[PDB]
């Protein structure tokens, strides 16, 4: 139910708050993305 961030390589829904490091549950790979918005988006279909 939900998520927030992600890990570039070991793509795995993560997340945390301030001063919780900036690493991942396993892959040190200190990157991390920010997975989509919930508010669905709409597009002109042309």
């Amino acid at each position: 139910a939900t998520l927030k961030y992600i890990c570039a390589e070991c793509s795995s829904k993560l997340s945390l708050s301030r001063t919780d490091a900036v690493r991942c549950k396993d892959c040190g790979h200190r990157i991390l993305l920010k997975a989509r918005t919930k508010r669905l988006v709409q597009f002109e279909a042309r």
């Binding site: 490091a21 040190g28 790979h29 200190r30 990157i31």
Partner: protein, 36 residues
Amino acid sequence: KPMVNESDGVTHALYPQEARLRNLTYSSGLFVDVKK
């Protein structure tokens, strides 16, 4: 071979793709046998 000596961690064997994203310098260590 390239390395990332960062505080709060070891020294990761740095790679292009990461140094680019992270704005680091894809460099490496230079060591010489100093004799005294």
